[PDB]
Amino acid sequence: NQQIADFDKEKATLDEADIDERMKLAQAFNDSLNNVVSGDPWSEEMKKKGRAEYARMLEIHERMGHVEIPVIDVDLPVYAGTAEEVLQQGAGHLEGTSLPIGGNSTHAVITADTGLPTAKMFTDLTKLKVGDKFYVHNIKEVMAYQVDQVKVIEPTNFDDLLIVPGHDYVTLLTCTPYMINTHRLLVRGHRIPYVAE
Numbered sequence: 177n178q179q180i181a182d183f184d185k186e187k188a189t190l191d192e193a194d195i196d197e198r199m200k201l202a203q204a205f206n207d208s209l210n211n212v213v214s215g216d217p218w219s220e221e222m223k224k225k226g227r228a229e230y231a232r233m234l235e236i237h238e239r240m241g242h243v244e245i246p247v248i249d250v251d252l253p254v255y256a257g258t259a260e261e262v263l264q265q266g267a268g269h270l271e272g273t274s275l276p277i278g279g280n281s282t283h284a285v286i287t288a289d290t291g292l293p294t295a296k297m298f299t300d301l302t303k304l305k306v307g308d309k310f311y312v313h314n315i316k317e318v319m320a321y322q323v324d325q326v327k328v329i330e331p332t333n334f335d336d337l338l339i340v341p342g343h344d345y346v347t348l349l350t351c352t353p354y355m356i357n358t359h360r361l362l363v364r365g366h367r368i369p370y371v372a373e
Contacts, residue, residue: 206279226259321366
C-alpha cells in the first residue's frame with residue numbers, strides 16, 4: 177500500500193546514471209550467479225538467517241520491487257532473502273535464484289506466506305491459472321509474466337526452481353495444501369512483451 181507507493185515514487189526520481197549503475201551491478205550478479213537454491217524458506221535453518229546483503233543494488237529502502245497480480249488483487253513488496261522477518265513483511269526473493277530483472281536464461285523465485293490471519297500474502301495464489309498475468313516491478317521497469325505451469329512439489333525438491341536455459345521465468349512460491357502446508361505450490365510465468373501505460 178504505502179510501501180508500494182513509496183517504492184514507485186522514489187523510483188521515478190532516480191537519475192538515469194544511478195539506474196544504469198544499479199542495473200550494471202544486478203546484471204553482473206545474474207551473469208555470475210551460482211544457481212543453487214539456498215533452501216526451503218520455512219525450514220528452521222532458513223527462518224533464522226541473518227541480513228541479506230546480496231541485492232542492495234536493486235533496493236530502495238530495503239525493497240527490491242513489488243509483484244502485482246491483478247486477478248487476485250495482490251501487490252506485494254519483495255525483499256532480499258527469505259528469513260522470518262522478511263516473510264512477516266512481504267515477499268522474499270529466494271537466494272540462489274536470478275535477481276528479478278529478467279533476461280534470456282533467467283529464473284527468479286519470489287516466495288510468500290499463505291493462510292495467515294494477519295496479512296493475506298499469497299493466500300489466494302491458489303486461484304491463479306495458466307494464462308494469468310503478473311507484473312514484476314523493479315527500479316528500471318515493469319516486467320510482464322504469463323503463467324505457463326502450476327505444480328506441487330515436496331519442499332526440498334528444487335529442480336523446478338533453477339534456470340531453464342533460453343527462457344525467462346519467475347516462479348511465485350507458497351505452501352500447500354490449504355492449512356496443511358506440507359508441500360509447495362509453484363506458479364511459474366514466462367516473460368512476455370509489455371509496455372506500461
